[PDB]
């Protein structure tokens, strides 16, 4: 556990999170929930 520092966090995050597909499931009054493309585009940043 204590062998997982900031660099390893960034590496694993860039392996698993950055620019990958997602799965969603919602229930209730979800008429005001952003569509798929919103979530899918928000998995990377254009600032950097």
């Amino acid at each position: 556990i204590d062998a997982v520092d900031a660099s390893t966090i960034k590496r694993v995050a860039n392996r698993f999170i950055y620019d990958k597909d997602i799965a969603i499931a919602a229930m209730g009054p979800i008429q005001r929930l952003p569509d798929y493309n919103w979530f899918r585009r928000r998995t990377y940043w254009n600032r950097y």
Binding site: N14, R47, Y48
Partner: protein, 60 residues
Amino acid sequence: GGIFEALYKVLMRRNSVYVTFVIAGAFVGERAVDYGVHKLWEHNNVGKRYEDISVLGQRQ
């Protein structure tokens, strides 16, 4: 193919690199299409150019 993935990993983990890539591609493709259209223009109509008149220097 795998070359597309390799290009994707090489160029698009940042954004300024993307901007530079777009500018470079623009100012290379411009030159390439200029060369192509000039060459085709020269090929299409031979003998009509300004440096092809046989009497260009006989009014001294």
